[PDB]
């Protein structure tokens, strides 16, 4: 079963397929990575098979990167304008981080304001406490709750949500801590997260 490592959804259709990197194995919605609606590759014209190879941006550059915004090494990355790397999901959820091209989600331009938040909050969900003050934490978005976590640490716990397009919320990406989360949403998100972990390995 294919799960997108950015949004943890499992729907895969001809318009938005969940694809897989043929080197590191990560799986992602075309539309969650800016690789949607692109013509078949030139290597693909050869084969008569129904599929063509695909590689994420980090593998295209021969790196197994770390993220400027969190301590996790898993998931899928985009290059920054300074030659560093960030998770797609970190860039979506961290305030003040935007994509320079929304259609292809590239590149990511991090600012002095982003860097001044490094280590500024302690991640309350880090399993390795040695990294709880690396990177940049987001907070719970319920009321004035001041609970902080890395984006990818919240993702694992099933805490990242995305508003539907019809809801017309300007920033549709939000997170709640466990105290304020939707219990059903957390259930299926952790389930898809765990299936994604078993899938890659």
């Amino acid at each position: 079963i294919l799960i997108c490592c950015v949004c943890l959804g499992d729907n895969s259709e001809d318009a938005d397929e969940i694809i897989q990197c043929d080197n590191c194995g990560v799986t992602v919605h075309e539309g969650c990575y800016g690789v949607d609606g692109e013509s078949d590759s030139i290597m693909s014209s050869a084969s008569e098979n129904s599929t063509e190879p695909w590689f994420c941006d980090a593998c295209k550059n021969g790196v197994s990167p770390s993220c400027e915004l969190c301590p996790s090494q898993d998931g899928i990355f985009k290059e920054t304008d300074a030659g560093r790397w960030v998770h797609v999901v970190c860039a979506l959820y961290v305030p003040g981080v935007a994509f320079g091209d929304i259609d292809k989600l590239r590149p990511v331009t991090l600012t002095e304001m982003n860097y001044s938040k490094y280590g500024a909050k302690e991640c309350s969900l880090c399993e390795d406490t040695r990294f709880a003050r690396t990177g940049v934490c987001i907070s719970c978005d319920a009321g004035m709750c001041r609970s902080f976590f890395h984006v990818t640490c919240a993702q694992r716990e099933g805490l990242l949500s995305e508003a539907a397009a019809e809801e017309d919320i300007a920033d549709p990406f939000f997170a709640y801590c466990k105290q304020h989360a939707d219990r059903f949403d957390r259930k299926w998100k952790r389930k898809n997260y765990l299936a994604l972990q078993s899938y890659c390995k």
């Binding site: 397929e17 694809i19 897989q20 043929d22 078949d40 129904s50 599929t51 695909w54």
Partner: peptide, 9 residues
């Protein structure tokens, strides 16, 4: 891998 657009209905 990725499914070619030619093979997408």
């Amino acid at each position: 891998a990725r499914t070619k657009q030619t093979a997408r209905k």
